[PDB]
Amino acid sequence: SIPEDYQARLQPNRVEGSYPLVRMEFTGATVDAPLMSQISRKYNIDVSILSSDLDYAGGVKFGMMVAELFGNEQDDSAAIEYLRENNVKVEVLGYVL
Amino acid sequence: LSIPEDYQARLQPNRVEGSYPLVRMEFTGATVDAPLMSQISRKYNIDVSILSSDLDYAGGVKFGMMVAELFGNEQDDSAAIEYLRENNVKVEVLGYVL
Ligand SMILES: [Cl-]
């Protein structure tokens, strides 16, 4: 489920002037922390949230979020590995030009 | 419009020591097109602890709701809430979580 105007602009590889579009999955294995806040501060990422379907039930926060990550290549790569280190599953769908 | 049991039990009408606001934020096509959670995370040093979100993007518009606990100082969270409102996010302070 990716909006069609983002699809039309989605490329497989990173070109000049494009930014990663990610789908992030959260489960009861994901570290319990304000991770979007932390990468916003630590790596100078603007997390442009497109869609989310996160829920909290039975003591667990779970679901998915799709976001475009605005920053530079070094910073967005660092932020993606930080999220993976904290057990967010991150799929880099492509780069939005 | 639901809020998880365990949060409900801890949710107070007023701000006490060691409590933090729980907010419900509504996004419509009137909301400024900006990475607002990132912006308040930096500008006001707010940790946005997201409980639930139901945000969709269709037809050029992001819309829906997000419920989050806002961790920071009282001065900073009040400033961040006003910043969100100024950017046309509807913000309901549901209470304070102790
Ligand atoms: Cl946002």
Curated annotation (Swiss-Prot), chain B:
Belongs to the ABC transporter superfamily. Methionine importer (TC 3.A.1.24) family. Part of the ABC transporter complex MetNIQ involved in methionine import. Responsible for energy coupling to the transport system. The complex is composed of two ATP-binding proteins (MetN), two transmembrane proteins (MetI) and a solute-binding protein (MetQ). It is found in: Cell inner membrane. The gene is metN. This is Methionine import ATP-binding protein MetN. It comes from Vibrio parahaemolyticus serotype O3:K6 (strain RIMD 2210633).
